[PDB]
Amino acid sequence: TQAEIKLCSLLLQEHFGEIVEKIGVHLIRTGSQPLRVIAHDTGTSLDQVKKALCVLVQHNLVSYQVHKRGVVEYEAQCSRVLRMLRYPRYIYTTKTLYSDTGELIVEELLLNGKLTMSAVVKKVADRLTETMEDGKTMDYAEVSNTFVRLADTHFVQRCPSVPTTENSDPGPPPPAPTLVINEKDMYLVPKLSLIGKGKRRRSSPIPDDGIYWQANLDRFHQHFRDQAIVSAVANRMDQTSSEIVRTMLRMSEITTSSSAPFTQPLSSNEIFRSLPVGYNISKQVLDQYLTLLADDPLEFVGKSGDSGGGMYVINLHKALASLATATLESVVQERFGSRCARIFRLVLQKKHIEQKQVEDFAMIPAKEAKDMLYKMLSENFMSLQEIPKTPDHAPSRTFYLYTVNILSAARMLLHRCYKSIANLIERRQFETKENKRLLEKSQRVEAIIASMQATGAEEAQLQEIEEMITAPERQQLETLKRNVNKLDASEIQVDETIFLLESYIECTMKRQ
C-alpha cells in the first residue's frame, strides 16, 4: 500500500497541514504505537504531537485502545483517510436527495468531524443567512426537521458514546475513557425546544452535551451501490425495469446488512404497492418483468422462493462482480483498442484457452492476436497456467492456458487508480507552486477591486488594473485556472472507478 501511503500523505497535507500529516503518515505506515514513540520516531515536539493527535481523533481518523499496564496505543485507519477524497460526491448526493439544509448539515459534519445537534443546527441557521435576503431569518425548527429526516434515513449517526462513570467503576479515572458503541441510541435524536435565529455577521447549559454526530459513510456507500446497480439495469433493459429495481433496492434499504451475500426476499404483491403512482402498470406485466430479469444470465435477481406468488430477491455480489468485470474490460478497451478487448472477453468467458483457440474463435490473425495476448500479460490482466507433463516444468513440454482472474486484476486496477489520483494531485500542486507569484499578484489586484467596490468605485481604477502588467499574464491565469479545474474534475471522476472496484474487493472477503 505504498500508493495508499502516498495518496494519504497528499490528502492529509492538503486538508490538515504539515505537522499533522507527519503524524498521520507515521501512524499509517508503522501501525499501533504509543504516544512517546510517535514523538521519538518522528522527531517533533511533544505539544505538536498532542495537537496533531487531537485533530486526527476529532475527524475519526485515528482510533485508540487500552492495553496492559495502562498504555494508550493509537492507530490510524487508512481507509478512512482515503474516503476524504469522496467528500464532494457526498455533498452532492445529500443535495440530490434533500434540500440545501440537508446539504449544509452533511457539509458541517464532514468539515468539523464531530459536532452536537445544537451546534450543527446553529451553524446551518447561521450559514443560510447569506443565501437569503430582505429580513427573512432562518429558524432552528425547519433545520431540525431535516436533521431528523437524515437521522431517520441513517445518513447521519451518533458517535460512540462515553460510559457513565458513576455506574462504571467509581474511583480513579482511567487514562482513556474507553468509548463503547451502543446499537440502541444511534438514531435516537435528542429533543430540542430551544429555537432561535441566525446572525447576519454584523461584527458589532447544553441539553445534548457529549452527544456528537458523525456522517455515516457506510450508508452513503450503500446508496452509491444502489445507484450503480440501478444505472446498470437502466442501461441494459429499460426504464420501467430500472424503476422496479430501484423500488426493490429501496425496500431492501432498511432491512438488510450493507455486507450480505443475499438480501431479504420480496413478495411481488408489495413490489406492486410500493411503486410511485406515475406508472400505468399491472400485476401481470410486473410478473413478466420479474421473470424476464430472472431469465438474464447476468442474474441481477434470483427466484429463491415460491410462496405468496411472485417471490423475488436482488443479487449483491453477482451484481458487483458484473460491474467490476465491466470496469476491468472498459479499461482494456480504452487502453489497447477494441480488437484486444475482444480477446479479453474471450479469455474471460471461456475460462481457459490456448493461442490457436483464440486465433480460431476471435477472427483475429496471427502477429496481432499474440501481440495483444502478450501485451495483456505484461500488464497483469491475464495469467498463465502451465499444466505440466513432467515435474521439470520445462517450457518445451507443457501446455499454456490463458486465464483471466477477476480478483487479482481488480486489485491491480485499484492499485493503478490510487497512483493515478496521486499523480493528478502532484501535477496540480506543481502548477500552483510554479505560478504562485502571479497567483498572489492576482490576489492583490482582486483585493484592490474588492475593496470599496460597493461605495465610490470609479471606472478609472478598472482600467488601471487593466493598464497594470497583469493583463499580459491574464492569459496565463486563464490557462492555470482551466488546468486546475480539469485536474480537480479528473480527481473527482476517477473515484467512480475506485468505488466500483473497492466494493468488489470488499465483498469478496470474509474477515474470519
Q: Which residues inside 356-395 make contact with another protein, applying CB under 8 A? A: 357, 359, 361-371, 374-375, 377-378, 380, 383-389, 391-395
Residue 273, phi then psi, degrees to nearest 5 = -75, -25
Edge-to-edge order in the sheet of strand 301-302:
266-267, 311-314, 301-302
- The answer to the question of residue 256 lying near another protein (CB under 8 A) is no
Identify residue 268 by its one-letter amino acid code: S
Site for another protein in 480-499 (CB under 8 A): 483, 485-498
**Member of 245, 353, 404, 410 binding another protein (CB under 8 A):** 353
**According to the 3-state scheme, what is the secondary structure of 186-237?**
HCCCCCCCCCCECCCCCCCCCCCCCCCEEECHHHHHHHHHHHHHHHHHHHHC
Q: Which stretch binds another protein (CB under 8 A): 216-224, 268-276, 301-309, 339-347?
A: 339-347
**Member of 193, 255, 280, 512 binding another protein (CB under 8 A):** 512
Q: Is there a contact between 402 and 353 (Cβ–Cβ < 8 Å)? A: yes
Q: In the stretch 144-173, what mask flags binding to another protein with x, by CB under 8 A?
A: ---------------x--x----------x
Site for another protein in 418-477 (CB under 8 A): 419-421, 423-424, 426-427, 430, 437, 447, 469, 472-473
**Member of 143, 245, 417, 507 binding another protein (CB under 8 A):** 417
* C-beta of 154 vs 236, nearer to another protein: 236
Site for another protein in 300-319 (CB under 8 A): none
Q: In the stretch 115-144, what mask flags binding to another protein with x, by CB under 8 A?
A: ------------------------------
* C-beta of 396 vs 455, nearer to another protein: 396
DSSP 282: -
Identify residue 311 by its one-letter amino acid code: M
The single residue listed with the C-alpha cell 430540542 is: 192
In the chain, residues preceding a discontinuity (C to N beyond 2.5 A) are 204
Q: What share of the chain is helix, strand, coil (3-state, %, to 5)?
A: 55, 10, 35
Q: Which stretch binds another protein (CB under 8 A): 188-196, 248-256, 265-273, 354-362?
A: 354-362
* Residue-wise DSSP of 151-179: HHTTSEEEPPBPP-TTTS--SSPPSS---
Alpha-carbon dihedral 328, 333, 339, 340, rounded to 10 degrees = -40
CB of residue 141 vs another protein: minimum separation in angstroms? Answer: 26
CB of residue 225 vs another protein: minimum separation in angstroms? Answer: 13
Q: In the stretch 2-21, what mask flags binding to another protein with x, by CB under 8 A?
A: x-xx--------xxxxxxx-
The C-alpha cell that represents 407 in the structure block: 480478483
Residues near another protein (CB under 8 A), total: 163
**Member of 42, 129, 148, 176 binding another protein (CB under 8 A):** 176
Phi/psi-derived region of residue 76, left when phi > 0, alpha when psi is between -120 and 50, beta in every other case: beta
